[PDB]
Write a protein of this length. Structure first.
Lengths: 126, 48, 136, 192, 79
RNA sequence: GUUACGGCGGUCCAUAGCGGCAGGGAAACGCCCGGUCCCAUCCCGAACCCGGAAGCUAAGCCUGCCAGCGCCGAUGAUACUACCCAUCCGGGUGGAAAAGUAGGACACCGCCGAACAC
RNA sequence: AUGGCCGAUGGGCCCCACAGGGUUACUGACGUCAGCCAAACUCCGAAUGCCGGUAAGUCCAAGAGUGCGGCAGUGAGACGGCG
């Protein structure tokens, strides 16, 4: 019989990210012409979606789950760059050229940093 | 680990009067620290 | 002589006398009680004169409960004064009583003495009242 | 304790509202409603005199067998509405119960006996909670206080109950408190 | 014997100036309030003194979100 | 199309919460190993950042069951009330609470993505 | 803010030290059971009233509304019904 006493670090980190993602979400919103680019980051992968918050539907998505990104010989930042290109091409195929960036509550730097500019250079004006 | 705000951490060795030797780090600038009574030396740790 | 130790506001509008009592209409502590039947401000002294009257008749045994507490103040302007120049200083403390309210409750072994004792208390109250017991 | 249901005749209500209910009272009938596990609210008018008679004899928690337009339904008096001054019965809530059903209700408590001469007996709680079969409900409970001395607390758990009866309320309730009789010195102190 | 009270301010004429179901142009003031009793919604902007106004023409519509009173504007349809 | 799976969102935002019991780790979500590199501590690689996959469902998360604490909550009656009738009492037509009772409830829905079937 | 239950806390007492322990018609917080009160209390919350939309009604007229212009008077009110 083990009764944990304190908060586990995993849930403290999980709750804190949710708390500091809402305060980001006060000003950032998406639209059918300017979809919000939501970023989710994990220790093994990364995920992006184009969300149209008027009706809460996703336009396009990309992630490090796809084996194409997995087969990249590089680093996590190199996988992130490959993801950034992928979402961009899927964005243009859906008819969007300008987005807003929802960094998702993570500090903008490192893997996210590689994600944003890789899509920025690919033609996603934001 | 902030660059300059911290005292310089010196690798040192503990030598005691009983011949016991310990390896650690410390602040002692000499880099070697001596001691007269240690845990082995201390009667309380030996039940004495 | 019951007065509140402190009150947030010392000068207040007169408590209104409309309606009938919604809470405290049934005897809860004792076996007999006095139930009001008309609206009137039962002041601070009338409670004291009535409570003393009960104790004198029941003598030693028994316990008396006073469900009414006079915490609502009333003011009067100083005598021989024209109207105006502000509100008068608070004078006496009253507790607003509506019909159905149970004021006193008395517990005593025998019924006959208890009913007589509560009857004396009624004569010290401005309202027409009746004595009510505990059962249905 | 198995009791026989009391028979009453009830008829449905054509119009409901404060206009109709007031007139119904003026006619000597008390409006009522009937709901239960069957999930079927029915509006009935009982005769005031016979309803009063049933309650006076069988207590407030009376088991009834209503006759609603020729149909016999077993019902229990859930609650009443007594006007504070007139002491009428303005409205009654009736709950249908099947035989052998566990129902939670409140019964009264009476203190019977003769306390020691230097003792004042105070009843803190009038009614206690009880779970029992619909027909096994006791009309009232008894507590005996004879030869009890000093400050002795008769709590709810100490009461003896008929078979098949459970004490839903916690035993910590202090139904009866016995203390030393106040003296004239003590009476003329409290309240000042 | 005198009164030390008797001072009062002007009445500020707060309240809800535009009620639900009314057609409002751009910039019309919807509610005049002191705190954020009413919170801005869609096409409703907050003024300096928490006065609410409209950024787009349409019909007012009061609503709630996350337990907060909100004021919105529905884009009435062009004929 | 299926799943005890990941996300992003909704509802006039607890009927959705709290707690107890049992249960899961395929991809995932995680904890976890380390401080060379971007980056960081009003001291601390704890947090944030970055590099990984040795170990684990014990936590987070998720699934199922509990009416235990909270939450919602009728019909009827009553309080109150607009209008009207009425010589001071009161009454009619319409509206109709709060509390309590019966009960409800251990959430519902939308868009992508996974492992797998096809 | 009434009456109970538990009892810190303090008063007081037995050991007696002023340290450490229990004792009491006492002081009895905190908590809890039962019954209540408030213009400057609100977990709740009507009826009327008000803002707007729509369909009608009166429509040989209420002699209605809105804008502009000429001419004024009024700016000492009273009682009755409701808050």
């Amino acid at each position: 019989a083990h009764k944990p006493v304190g908060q586990n670090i995993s849930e403290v980190r999980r709750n804190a990210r949710l708390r500091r993602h809402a305060r980001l979400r006060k000003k950032v919103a998406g639209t059918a012409e300017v979809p919000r680019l939501v970023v989710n980051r994990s220790a093994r992968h990364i995920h992006v979606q184009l969300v149209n918050d008027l009706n809460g539907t996703t336009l396009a998505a990309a992630s490090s789950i796809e084996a194409d990104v997995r087969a990249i010989d590089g680093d996590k930042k190199a996988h992130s760059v490959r993801v950034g290109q992928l979402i961009a091409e899927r964005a243009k195929a859906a008819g969007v050229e300008t987005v807003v960036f929802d960094r998702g509550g993570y500090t903008y730097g490192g893997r996210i940093a590689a994600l944003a500019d890789a899509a920025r250079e690919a033609g996603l004006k934001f | 680990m902030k660059t300059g705000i911290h005292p310089e951490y010196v690798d040192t060795t503990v030598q005691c009067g009983c011949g016991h030797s310990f390896t650690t780090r410390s602040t002692k600038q000499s880099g070697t620290i001596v001691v007269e009574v240690c845990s082995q030396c201390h009667p309380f740790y030996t039940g004495k | 002589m019951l007065i509140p130790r402190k009150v947030k506001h010392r000068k207040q509008h007169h408590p209104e006398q409309r309606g009938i009592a919604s809470g405290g209409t049934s005897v809860s502590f004792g076996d007999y009680g006095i139930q009001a039947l008309e609206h009137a401000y039962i002041t601070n002294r009338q409670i004291e004169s009535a409570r003393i009257a009960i104790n004198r008749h029941i003598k030693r045994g028994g316990k008396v409960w006073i469900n009414i507490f006079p915490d609502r103040p009333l003011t009067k302007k100083p005598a021989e004064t024209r109207m105006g120049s502000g509100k008068g200083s608070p004078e006496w403390w009253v507790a607003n009583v509506k019909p159905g309210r149970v004021l006193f409750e008395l517990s005593y072994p025998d019924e006959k003495t208890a009913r007589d004792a509560l009857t004396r208390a009624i004569h010290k109250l401005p309202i027409k009242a009746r004595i009510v017991t505990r059962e249905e | 304790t198995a009791n026989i249901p009391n028979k009453l005749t009830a008829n449905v209500r054509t119009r409901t509202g404060k206009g109709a209910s007031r007139q119904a009272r003026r006619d000597g009938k008390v409006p009522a409603v009937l709901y239960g596990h069957g999930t079927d609210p029915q509006h009935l008018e009982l005769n005031a005199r016979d309803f009063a008679a049933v309650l006076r004899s069988h207590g407030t928690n009376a088991i009834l067998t209503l006759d609603i337009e020729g149909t016999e339904q077993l019902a229990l008096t859930k609650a009443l509405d007594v006007h504070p001054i007139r002491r009428n019965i303005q409205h009654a809530d009736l709950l249908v119960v099947q035989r052998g059903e566990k129902v939670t209700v409140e019964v009264t408590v009476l203190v019977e006996g003769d306390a020691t001469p230097g003792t004042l007996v105070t009843q803190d709680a009038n009614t206690i909670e009880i779970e029992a079969e619909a027909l096994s409900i006791p009309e009232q409970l008894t507590v005996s206080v004879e030869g009890v001395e000093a400050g002795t607390q008769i709590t709810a758990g100490q009461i003896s109950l008929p078979e098949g009866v459970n004490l839903i309320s916690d035993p910590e309730l202090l139904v009866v408190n016995v203390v030393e009789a106040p003296s004239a010195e003590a009476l003329e102190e409290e309240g000042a | 014997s005198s009164s030390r009270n008797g001072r009062d301010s002007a009445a500020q004429r707060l309240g809800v100036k535009r009620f639900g179901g009314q057609v409002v142009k751009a910039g019309e003031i919807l509610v005049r309030q002191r705190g954020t009793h009413f919170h801005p919604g869609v096409n409703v902007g907050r003024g300096g003194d928490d006065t609410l106004f409209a950024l787009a023409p349409g019909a007012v519509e009061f609503g709630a979100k996350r337990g907060r009173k909100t004021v919105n504007i529905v884009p009435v349809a062009r004929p």
